Amino acid sequence: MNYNNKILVSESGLSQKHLIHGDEELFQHELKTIFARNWLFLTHDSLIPAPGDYVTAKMGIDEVIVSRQNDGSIRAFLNVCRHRGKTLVSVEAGNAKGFVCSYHGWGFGSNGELQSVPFEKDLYGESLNKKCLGLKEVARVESFHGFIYGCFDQEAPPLMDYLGDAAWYLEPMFKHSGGLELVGPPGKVVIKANWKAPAENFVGDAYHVGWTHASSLRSGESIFSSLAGNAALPPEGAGLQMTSKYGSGMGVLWDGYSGVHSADLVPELMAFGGAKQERLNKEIGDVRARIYRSHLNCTVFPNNSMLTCSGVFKVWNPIDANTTEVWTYAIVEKDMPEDLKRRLADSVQRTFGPAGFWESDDNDNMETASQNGKKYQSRDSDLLSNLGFGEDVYGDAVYPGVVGKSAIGETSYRGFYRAYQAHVSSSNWAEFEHASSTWHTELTKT
Amino acid sequence: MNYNNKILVSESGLSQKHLIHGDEELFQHELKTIFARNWLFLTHDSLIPAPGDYVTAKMGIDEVIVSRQNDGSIRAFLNVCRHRGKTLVSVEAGNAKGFVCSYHGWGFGSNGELQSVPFEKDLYGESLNKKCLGLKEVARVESFHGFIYGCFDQEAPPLMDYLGDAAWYLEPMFKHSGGLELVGPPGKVVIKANWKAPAENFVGDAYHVGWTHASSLRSGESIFSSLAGNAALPPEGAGLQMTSKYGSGMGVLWDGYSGVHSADLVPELMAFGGAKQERLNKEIGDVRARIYRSHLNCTVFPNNSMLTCSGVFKVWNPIDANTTEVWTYAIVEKDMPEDLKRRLADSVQRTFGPAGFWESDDNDNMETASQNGKKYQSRDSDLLSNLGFGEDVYGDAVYPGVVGKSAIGETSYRGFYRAYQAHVSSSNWAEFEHASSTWHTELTKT
Amino acid sequence: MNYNNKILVSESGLSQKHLIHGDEELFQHELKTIFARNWLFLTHDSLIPAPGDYVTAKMGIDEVIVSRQNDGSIRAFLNVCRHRGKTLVSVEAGNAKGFVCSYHGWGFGSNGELQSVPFEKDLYGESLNKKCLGLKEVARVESFHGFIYGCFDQEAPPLMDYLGDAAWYLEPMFKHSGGLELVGPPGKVVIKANWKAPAENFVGDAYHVGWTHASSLRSGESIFSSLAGNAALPPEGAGLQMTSKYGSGMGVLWDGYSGVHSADLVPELMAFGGAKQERLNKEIGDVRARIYRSHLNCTVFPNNSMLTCSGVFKVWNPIDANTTEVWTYAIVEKDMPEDLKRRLADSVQRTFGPAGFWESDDNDNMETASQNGKKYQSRDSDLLSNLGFGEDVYGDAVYPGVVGKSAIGETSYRGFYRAYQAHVSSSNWAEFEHASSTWHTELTKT
Amino acid sequence: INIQEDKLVSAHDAEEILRFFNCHDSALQQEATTLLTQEAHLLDIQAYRAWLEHCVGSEVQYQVISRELRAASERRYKLNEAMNVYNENFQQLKVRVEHQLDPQNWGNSPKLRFTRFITNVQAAMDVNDKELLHIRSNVILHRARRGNQVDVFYAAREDKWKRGEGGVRKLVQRFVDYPERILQTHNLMVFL
Amino acid sequence: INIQEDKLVSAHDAEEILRFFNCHDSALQQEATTLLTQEAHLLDIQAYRAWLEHCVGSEVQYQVISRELRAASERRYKLNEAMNVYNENFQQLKVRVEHQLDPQNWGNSPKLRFTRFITNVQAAMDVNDKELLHIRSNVILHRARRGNQVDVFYAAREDKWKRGEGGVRKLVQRFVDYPERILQTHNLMVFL
Amino acid sequence: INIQEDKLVSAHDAEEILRFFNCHDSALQQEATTLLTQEAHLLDIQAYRAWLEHCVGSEVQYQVISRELRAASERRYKLNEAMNVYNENFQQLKVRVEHQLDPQNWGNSPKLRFTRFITNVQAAMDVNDKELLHIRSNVILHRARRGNQVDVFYAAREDKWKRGEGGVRKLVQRFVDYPERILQTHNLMVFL
Numbered sequence A, B, C: 001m002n003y004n005n006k007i008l009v010s011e012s013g014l015s016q017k018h019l020i021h022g023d024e025e026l027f028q029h030e031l032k033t034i035f036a037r038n039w040l041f042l043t044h045d046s047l048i049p050a051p052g053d054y055v056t057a058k059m060g061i062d063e064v065i066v067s068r069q070n071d072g073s074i075r076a077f078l079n080v081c082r083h084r085g086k087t088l089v090s091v092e093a094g095n096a097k098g099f100v101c102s103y104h105g106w107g108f109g110s111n112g113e114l115q116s117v118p119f120e121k122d123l124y125g126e127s128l129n130k131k132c133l134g135l136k137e138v139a140r141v142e143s144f145h146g147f148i149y150g151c152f153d154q155e156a157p158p159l160m161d162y163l164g165d166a167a168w169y170l171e172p173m174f175k176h177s178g179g180l181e182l183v184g185p186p187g188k189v190v191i192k193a194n195w196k197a198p199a200e201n202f203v204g205d206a207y208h209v210g211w212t213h214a215s216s217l218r219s220g221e222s223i224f225s226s227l228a229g230n231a232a233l234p235p236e237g238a239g240l241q242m243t244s245k246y247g248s249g250m251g252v253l254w255d256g257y258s259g260v261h262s263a264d265l266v267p268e269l270m271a272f273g274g275a276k277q278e279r280l281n282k283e284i285g286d287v288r289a290r291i292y293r294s295h296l297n298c299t300v301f302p303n304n305s306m307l308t309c310s311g312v313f314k315v316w317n318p319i320d321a322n323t324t325e326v327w328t329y330a331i332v333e334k335d336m337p338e339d340l341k342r343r344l345a346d347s348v349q350r351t352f353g354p355a356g357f358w359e360s361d362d363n364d365n366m367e368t369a370s371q372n373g374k375k376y377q378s379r380d381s382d383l384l385s386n387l388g389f390g391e392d393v394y395g396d397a398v399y400p401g402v403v404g405k406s407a408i409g410e411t412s413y414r415g416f417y418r419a420y421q422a423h424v425s426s427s428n429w430a431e432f433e434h435a436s437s438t439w440h441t442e443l444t445k446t
Numbered sequence D, E, F: 001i002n003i004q005e006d007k008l009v010s011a012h013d014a015e016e017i018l019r020f021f022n023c024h025d026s027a028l029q030q031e032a033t034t035l036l037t038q039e040a041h042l043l044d045i046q047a048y049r050a051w052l053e054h055c056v057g058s059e060v061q062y063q064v065i066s067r068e069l070r071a072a073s074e075r076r077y078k079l080n081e082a083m084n085v086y087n088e089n090f091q092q093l094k095v096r097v098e099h100q101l102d103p104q105n106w107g108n109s110p111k112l113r114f115t116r117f118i119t120n121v122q123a124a125m126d127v128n129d130k131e132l133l134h135i136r137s138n139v140i141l142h143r144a145r146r147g148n149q150v151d152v153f154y155a156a157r158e159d160k161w162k163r164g165e166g167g168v169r170k171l172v173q174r175f176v177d178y179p180e181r182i183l184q185t186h187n188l189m190v191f192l
């Protein structure tokens, strides 16, 4: 397939070829043009707070070691020995000054440097140039309020610029709340879906909630419960949708601070968020203080998603076109009482974890939609994302980005797939930028 | 591989490259040139007799919904939602006026039309053109005496023409018997064989029966039992073989009405078939009345096979080059007593179903022959189908098609593979026809 | 990938692209340029000593029948019927005058000839040319002191020439000891590693032993035990490494006759080898008699490895780029007392068999090093084999081949991969020879 | 159980539970365990004739069904709900046993390897027929052949056992509703 | 057990062994086997309401954890060692049961098929609370759905059971440390 | 069993059946079940030293074989029919236990997870040696490691147990004929 010419996503992001969820050659191409090019979630400060603390993480299909340095910074390295290529670290988290390979015993520092080689003097003499044998380092590692992302491409925009207009929406919860902590360890489950299926669902799919999650809404008693079985449409002005230049987007459901949490947490949460909102009015204004305590369903392009307020934090780790390893963490506000943090973390897993009853409602949807992308008669068929097209705006006086001023629509799908297509057809960041110079105009046509 | 030039089947169908049972690129090519082009078995009237009744079926690797319409006709549609591509129907059979998608709740009629979209007015307004969003319909659906076949290619010959000379042999049992019913549900088992291995076996392989099925013949006591362990060759004039332009073919074993059925059913069956034959003599003549009560091992090209009289009905559903999902139904004559239909259906499964002791004799044969097609030293090796070559006729005064007037030979393999090669090397039906204008001459050479 | 141009192994064998352990297209290419071209281990005289005795063996991904002929020779044939391609023999060993196919009953002789076809006269008449329908025969089958190898390529050098300089090192144990027997049946286990990972490890990896096998050395009490956890480097002159033109190579650990065998066998073995060495001094000289009772870790290119004295004999049978079927036999000296042969065979399996505690130490090393070869950021990375480079010699007065006069280094990796690259980039033996005319000069540079 | 409240429970399953929740006889569960363990041992070593002689009643119905997947809310479509993978009388079991033992059953060379794991044994005497013993048990059946073929079967078995010749308890009915609709085990050619 | 000598054994595991190696009551192991077999039967037929009513105590903690992979020699990193796949009180179990029974739970049509295999049952009364019964058992849980989806779960269960209403023994704690870190079963939406 | 009639049955298997079909002692099957459940518990928590001390006799032969695939009708080829995956005396088991416990056994970090399921327990005292207890049982052994590696082993175990120091019954012979010829579990580095 010629990725320079093939129209996988139609103009304005209105449709996508179904093959994108099933084609293995395209998956291999995404490794280069999506995963090796863009910012990918690694970890949080809260998981590696002290010097020597490390975790392992996936970046695309690659595995990296992410380590807190003595100077307080974080560096990340391929989890692959520079000698004969054995996997260096076999655990998920720990604290160490270095990593020793179990094959021939080469010792690498937390800073990636090759520090020791067994019997170096007797064997290599002075001929081994250890300075050139450090672990292969992730070029770019940056933080968004404690959330650590990595990028293999030195040419990428800074993480903040990459978040584009989405950053404005995230800041009240990520920054002005006093900060978030990520509660680990994550749940980990393999699903038979393409990574894009859950990514698109979290980025912009409010339409599915009442029907897909009818049973979870009805039996859980959460605040979004009126939606169960499409019994009731949210009122006008119930929310909005947004998207951005580099593909990140989200839905906003006004005031939904208790999120998917069952009735047992609703009063406590609605009290807590409301109280903090009252303080924030004076600091960041009424609109942004309201956004803080509003439910955001967001994907940070390409494969990191979240539900703020619900506190669900996801990584959709790609394995092949119909296989994804789902990592699920809980996010909590640092200044919440510890007992509430604990119950919130359990509730995140209860609803969206490995045995999350909400997340289970989504399985067949994402798995079959992905697997149908391999079927002969569907490969060239068009997945539709036209809901709300022709009613999006850009440059609004209050809400930035390409915005649909309605709670339910496909605005964020269009921006996600516009960026996806721009990357797949480009060889580098400069080409992506050239392909994106009229990004908002394309999205707001008609 | 260049399918326009590559000789996968030699002249006159005398040999085939072993790779055809193992090559995944060829399997993908068959999806286009075999399965998307030809007639494939869907269901029987008896399984969806009433308005609203539906089943799911495979057509190649695609899944379709096959539904009885209010006007009494049958239409078939891809089992894929027109919105974001989720699988619409998750069951195998039922009765409904429509199908609702579990993702965003789009509702489709039994006629494939998009009938309802949740909150359409509030969300889409008047912009959603539901008329253009009907399920992707199978272009051609036709019946052969209650047996329903589908074809994705609008250019295909009518089903009756496609059956060609094979139809004449099928008619006494399918039509003149008063009609057949298909007894469901089918058994379903995955085997590690190429779909062509069982297809070729049922189309023309009488040679294997005495040796492959030695144990089943010896312990079951069926009427073909004299063959066990090649202890006895069938006499001259014990039967014949035939093949046809579009690849369908069969063997005919004269008088074998009780088929593979164990001794417990032999007297009852031989009485029933003989009695009906005596009535049919007067209606269709002695030869065709005899054919009615003769055992036909048939493949309807490409992947539907049957043993008449035994009542075995098979679909070899392709999964990949070494994986096939075997569907097994029972066929019975409508005017048989109900208790006999029930015992016949059980006996079909007993012999050829998921725990069919006859069918088990075939497993290693079909699996290893298929898997060897992947092995390096065998890919370019020649599978032989020359038995009886130079003794076939065409245009016989009594028996139509290309016919070998002997019970055991490879006539039907040659016609099957001649049609297969003509399709694989052609881009459309017109090209197949051009490649087939001397089909019988090629088969009767020497 | 263009195998004529692609530098998979750098000059002098100093590095290899990590993709070689993971790339499936290259694996397919190796089937042609490595496995169909080179000598592969089949069996030993001791396993098929009598006329009619046979075993099955893999050659690459192909399966062959290896049979003792009436005239005392051995012939090998593809385990594939010449009719419709079914696997002929389903067992691993036995005694028979022929093999009958379970599909249509064709009977082949132990000499591969098509001897019988059921009902040939009635069915084929005189038209079946059985003389042209013999099993596909392995072109070349030769013996090295009872060890039987096969080669599909008639153009290959004789087995003795192919062993090149490695033969000189093997002869004291294989020939001058009075001869070896292979004790079957082998253990058989699938590992998720590329075949080259264990092949390279056995050909030249002494460096890994102290660290990888620290636990096995510490708990077993073998004579190499001082190495545990890199507590002690072997002294100077503890051994050497060698490699050869056609890729075979080995390490030599002086005097290590009890090998990996736990303390319970050490005194008996050290006594036995020492006694035979004293007799051999007079026949083959002190150096070669010493080599007899020295531990050789050897790979016979491409995928046959062994530890002499330890008595471990391995075949790394390729399945795909990350899958290998490991066959493990025991080798014993014919003139050892039978009770000692039995205990030695058990000890080989105890240490290196399916539950071999030594072999288990290697699993993660070989599996992860192989699997990392598929990961995007590692495919183009360089596996290092530069240890000892610039200190190898050729044409030494005492020790032949390209030799590193030290126990631990990567000399044998370099020769293994030099030959590998020469084959992968060549279309036939003549091209390999042209690519190898300065083989030792390339290896001894700098 | 009230199947109006417990929406997912079939009438048949509710009936069967009732049988065991009532009178519990520890000694009967003991006998049942012995009976099934010995049966599984005979089957595992492929002593099929011994199995028929010692474990199988002359009036046996040996039945394994495969049920078509239907909508949970389906109430109109009423055609055959299941097919019989097995539905054997004693003579039909004997045919299958002869097929297994025939020296021209090519698939049985090299010899197959069976390992059965029987668990969750429950036993209760029938209400009407004080000579009819109901036994429920679950089986994992492992079949290995030809180097690398491995098939694992999982099922619940509803049995009736009754004393036959010699006073030996023998199987007079086995019913299995096989839980996987599409078999991924090449076939179901095993005695569950 | 001495965990200074038996280096691989956790303090918790050593504590639990001690509980059963001591007083052995064959009758208690009998009762425990019956209790778990009946529980598994109710679950297998999806009688989730009956399971709650008959098997689950009002004070239940139903917990399944997934433990992060750490170095065997790790002694400094002290952040949360595990997450809760399940950590449910009675009301939370009831929510999950209602979710299962809801006619708009689309994933439950066509009906799922469950088969559970309970083995290795051990039982001992608590030292302090003579009314608290410790039961240990292992489960293989087979879930089949939608033609060709098959998921098999494996786990050890540390239970506490106590007599509740009517004198019926009910589950008051279940603890499972799930042995696979990354689930290959699509989800863990089964009651272990 | 008559192996002339039951063609598929080996002489060895027929001998072993005879042992259990005769005298049946329910109490002995009880003791055997306890013995194997406790052994499996010690193994599952990786208390390998405790296993050796409490479960393994000084005179033990611990043997697991892999039998070469031969023709069912083979009668001439008479070379070694099997190899020993295990054939260990007490000292050799101790070596393997030390290898497991060594802090430089890199493959044991992060810690492995074992779950064993023991079923089909049969027990009978030996005829000649009234102190020798024959126990037969089947095992499913689940080993999980490193996030997504999962290996499941299946086997029948022919044991002899005898009272040792303190009057504690200990394993003096285990024999397993492993049913899969080519292992698909990376290795057989587990104590079956």
Ligand SMILES: c1ccc2c(c1)CCC2
Pocket: A201, A202, A203, A205, A206, A209, A251, A297, A307
């Ligand atoms: C609102 C509430 C929940 C969810 C979304 C939106 C998208 C995914 C899950």
Ligand SMILES: c1ccc2c(c1)CCC2
Pocket: B201, B202, B203, B205, B206, B209, B251, B297, B307
């Ligand atoms: C006669 C009888 C049985 C069968 C055939 C012919 C072909 C397949 C099975």
Ligand SMILES: c1ccc2c(c1)CCC2
Pocket: C201, C202, C203, C205, C206, C209, C251, C297, C307
């Ligand atoms: C010395 C001793 C053991 C081994 C080697 C060298 C290479 C592999 C195993």
Ligand code: FES
Pocket: A081, A082, A083, A084, A085, A086, A101, A102, A103, A104, A105, A106
């Ligand atoms: S592979 Fe890591 S030290 Fe050799």
Ligand code: FES
Pocket: B081, B082, B083, B084, B085, B086, B101, B102, B103, B104, B105, B106
């Ligand atoms: S995918 Fe079917 S309604 Fe959206």
Ligand code: FES
Pocket: C081, C082, C083, C084, C085, C086, C101, C102, C103, C104, C105, C106
């Ligand atoms: S395939 Fe071997 S005789 Fe036909």
Ligand SMILES: [Fe+3]
Pocket: A201, A208, A209, A212, A213, A358, A361, A362
């Ligand atoms: Fe959802």
Ligand SMILES: [Fe+3]
Pocket: B201, B208, B209, B212, B213, B358, B361, B362
């Ligand atoms: Fe057949």
Ligand SMILES: [Fe+3]
Pocket: C201, C208, C209, C212, C213, C358, C361, C362
């Ligand atoms: Fe090693």
